């Protein structure tokens, strides 16, 4: 079939930093992929546009998607406040992997993370549903603004986002 492709235009303290596009594996994780896609277009009203990456740990991952509380404690899916873990077919095999952040089994909302390294210990706990297609260097560049505990030195936000294909 055809997997959706979405993009994120990143900005640091307002200054445009570049674009990152993802391939969502709708063929294997349809519901999870649809959720991310819809949140990227903003077709349901709420979405990712304007939200920031509140947690960046260099060498581990970049986390964002909490557009309601902006600190990892909020966010919601197009299915409600949270949906079940669709499946664990895909694994965290390396940099670029797009996975779902959560606070335990079946607590998927809108938060996600982009891996900047192989994080095998997350397999079976977080649903992998896509991967970076283009702009991986933009993701690595974002690490420059993170810290060991995740606190970011600058305001990293999703200036704009949408669907390409």
């Amino acid at each position: 079939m055809v997997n959706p492709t979405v993009f994120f235009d990143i900005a640091v303290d307002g200054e445009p930093l570049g674009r990152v596009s993802f391939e969502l594996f709708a063929d294997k994780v349809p519901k999870t992929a649809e959720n991310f896609r819809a949140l990227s277009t903003g077709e349901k009203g709420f979405g990712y546009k304007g939200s920031c990456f509140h947690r960046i740990i260099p060498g581990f991952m970049c986390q964002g998607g909490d557009f309601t509380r902006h600190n990892g404690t909020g966010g919601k899916s197009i299915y409600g406040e949270k949906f079940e873990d669709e499946n664990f077919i895909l694994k965290h095999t390396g940099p670029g992997i797009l996975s779902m952040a959560n606070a335990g089994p079946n607590t998927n909302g809108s938060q996600f993370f982009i891996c900047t390294a192989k994080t095998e210990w997350l397999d079976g706990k977080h649903v992998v549903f896509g991967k970076v297609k283009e702009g991986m260097n933009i993701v690595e560049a974002m690490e420059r603004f993170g810290s060991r505990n995740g606190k970011t030195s600058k305001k990293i936000t999703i200036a704009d986002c949408g669907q390409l294909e």
């Binding site: 991952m61 986390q63 909490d66 990892g72 404690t73 966010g75 996975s99 952040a101 959560n102 606070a103 607590t107 909302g109 938060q111 993370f113 994080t119 997350l122 706990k125 977080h126």
Partner: peptide, 4 residues
């Protein structure tokens, strides 16, 4: 929300 994790990951830990």
């Amino acid at each position: 929300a994790g990951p830990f």
